[PDB]
Design a protein around this ligand. Sequence first.
Ligand SMILES: [Zn+2]
Length: 301
Amino acid sequence: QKTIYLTEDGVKYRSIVLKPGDSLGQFGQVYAKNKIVFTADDVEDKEILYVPTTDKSILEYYGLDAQKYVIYLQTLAQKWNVQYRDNFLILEWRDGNCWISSAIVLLQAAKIRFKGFLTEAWAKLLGGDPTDFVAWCYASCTAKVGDFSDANWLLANLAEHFDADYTNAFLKKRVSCNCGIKSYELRGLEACIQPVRATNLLHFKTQYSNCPTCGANNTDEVIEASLPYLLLFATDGPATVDCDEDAVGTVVFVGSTNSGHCYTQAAGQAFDNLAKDRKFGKKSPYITAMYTRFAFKNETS
Ligand SMILES: [Zn+2]
């Protein structure tokens, strides 16, 4: 006979006694962590089991809707290994998980801090248990283990929970064409995450397009920035350029839009969880660059 602990959130529990005859159907659907459970025979005395929730406070705590939360719980069964590369934790490779591994290295390079559910999940990962954090990553992208997914989608998802000073995050841009010289400002999270043609500061600071109102070439320039962090995302696939030395890290993409592989560069090193011996390359096909405590002002002419 067994006493098991049921939880909707991983914080509040209720105990339940399973007599030798009983089954798990009585609880509705249940999920276990780092093991697979089909029947009450698979559950040990004092084991914790997780159940789905529709409670708005719990879902808002997690930052997931009810359907993503179900995927979260499903991915709790997985068992991952963390490995150490110098001072960085990497997620041991399997099943196309390099987009997640890459995000994990990059956020270490930035010394990111989280708020909410992800604070404890990240702390647990850094302590050597990646289960909760990795399950959240899959969930946020509605992804199954085995899926490859957009590392920049994942980072944008995580960024919503950064414990960053978004209040005073500020970006001012100047647009020039035959319509005139105009300016616009971005604040908070939308200011910190920036789509670019290629991920370095040169391409961030000046963008070239054609104006849809007049006929001419237009120039969109950064003239002022004060940001807790800056994420540059490639808009049209990987673009091969020199990274900036100022970046805390970058993400490299190799392969095709179908069979693609990600790895992170930081502290002058390549962290490829699939290829141990990959070398740092300053010029690489980048999809991501990250900067911390970024500030800039352009007063010319
Ligand atoms: Zn114009």
